[PDB]
């Protein structure tokens, strides 16, 4: 990871066993679930390409998924060099060289070259760009090993609303669709794929109906049948 005690004066502190051990334990359970991406993002704040490579090097499970991720990174790196979008030319004496995708993924770049780009003006964020490529690959893995579609998430005959909501929200989180589509899914689809007994109450909610209000509304409408104070 990168440490700064003065801004622009980056020092690299080498990644430690506890970090790697925690990361591997997250990978062991959470790789095929949308849990991995935010934890990976939290870990990758202030990361070098060397740190990111060390994180990918310390995984040894799930090789088909790892190959799909590696192939995805190679194609992102190729597309970047086809664009060539961070540039400065070679004419000027004593100025930083232009980034390649191979440099971004930490194979043709040294740690001092990586530090040079990140301590530049504008700061050229080689770790953030590489991290975004990894996040796209993780989301591709999450999509690939996803069990079933958001449209097909539906509440059983007398099923708890809360269990249905947790499955729906996990599936919605792992879905990559537009923000307006996601707002329509929370407003419409979540209400629509609710069971008929719950759904009439959900449709009869007023202006500005919140998920908390929906939980309150469906509480006592599903789960175990009433076994006292009902006859």
Site for a second copy in 122-151 (CB under 8 A): 140, 144-145, 147-149, 151
Which residue, 86 or 221, has its beta carbon nearer to a second copy? 221
Residue 61 gets the label, from left (phi > 0), alpha (psi -120 to 50) or beta, of beta
Residue 83 or 144 with smaller CB distance to a second copy: 144
**Cα dihedral across residues 26, 29, 32, 34: positive or negative:** negative
From the list 118, 112, 108, the residue with the least C-alpha distance to 86 is 118
Quick one: which of 52, 68, 113, 133 contacts a second copy (CB under 8 A)? 68
Report the C-alpha gap between 126 and 101 in whole angstroms.
Answer: 9
Expressed in percent and rounded to 5, the helix, strand and coil fractions of the chain are: 55, 5, 40
Q: Kindly state the smallest distance separating residue 193's Cβ from a second copy, in Å.
A: 6
Residues 80-109 within binding reach of a second copy (CB under 8 A): none
The reply to whether 30 sits near a second copy by the rule CB under 8 A is yes
CA separation for the pair 175, 111 (Å, rounded): 36
**Positions 183 through 202 that interact with a second copy (CB under 8 A):** 184, 188-189, 192-193, 195-197, 199-202
What the block records as the tokens of 48 is: 């070098």
Contact pattern for a second copy over residues 31 through 50, marking x by CB under 8 A: x-xxxxxxx-xxxxxx----
121 binds a second copy per the rule CB under 8 A: no
Q: C-beta of 139: minimal distance to a second copy in Å?
A: 12
Min dist. Cβ of residue 110 to a second copy (A)? 11
* Residue placing its CB nearer to a second copy in the complex, 81 or 197: 197
Q: Under the criterion CB under 8 A, does residue 52 sit at the interface with a second copy?
A: no
CA-based nearest residue to 134, from 11, 27, 25, 61: 27
Q: Is residue 18 close enough to count as binding a second copy by CB under 8 A?
A: yes
Alpha helices in 62-178 (DSSP H): 63-83, 101-104, 111-118, 126-144, 161-174
Q: Does 166 bind a second copy (CB under 8 A)?
A: yes
Name the 3-class secondary structure at 3: strand
Residue from 49, 96, 112, 131 binding a second copy (CB under 8 A): 112
């Amino acid at each position: 990871p990168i440490v700064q005690n003065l801004q622009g004066q980056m020092v690299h502190q080498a990644i430690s066993p506890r970090t790697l051990n925690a990361w591997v334990k997250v990978v062991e359970e959470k790789a095929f679930s949308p849990e991995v991406i935010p934890m990976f993002s939290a870990l990758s704040e202030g990361a070098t390409p060397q740190d990111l490579n060390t994180m990918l090097n310390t995984v040894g499970g799930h090789q088909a998924a790892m190959q799909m991720l590696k192939e995805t990174i190679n194609e992102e790196a190729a597309e970047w060099d086809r664009l060539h979008p961070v540039h400065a030319g070679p004419i000027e004496p004593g100025q930083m060289r232009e980034p390649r995708g191979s440099d971004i993924a930490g194979t043709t770049s040294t740690l001092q070259e990586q530090i040079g780009w990140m301590t530049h003006n504008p700061p050229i964020p080689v770790g953030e760009i590489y991290k975004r490529w990894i996040i796209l690959g993780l989301n591709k893995i999450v999509r690939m090993y996803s069990p079933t579609s958001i449209l097909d998430i539906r509440q059983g005959p007398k099923e708890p609303f809360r269990d249905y909501v947790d499955r729906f929200y996990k599936t919605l989180r792992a879905e990559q669709a537009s923000q307006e589509v996601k707002n329509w899914m929370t407003e419409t689809l979540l209400v629509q794929n609710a069971n008929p007994d719950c759904k009439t109450i959900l449709k009869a909610l007023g202006p500005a109906a919140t998920l908390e209000e929906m939980m309150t509304a469906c509480q006592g409408v599903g789960g175990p049948g009433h076994k006292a104070r009902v006859l």
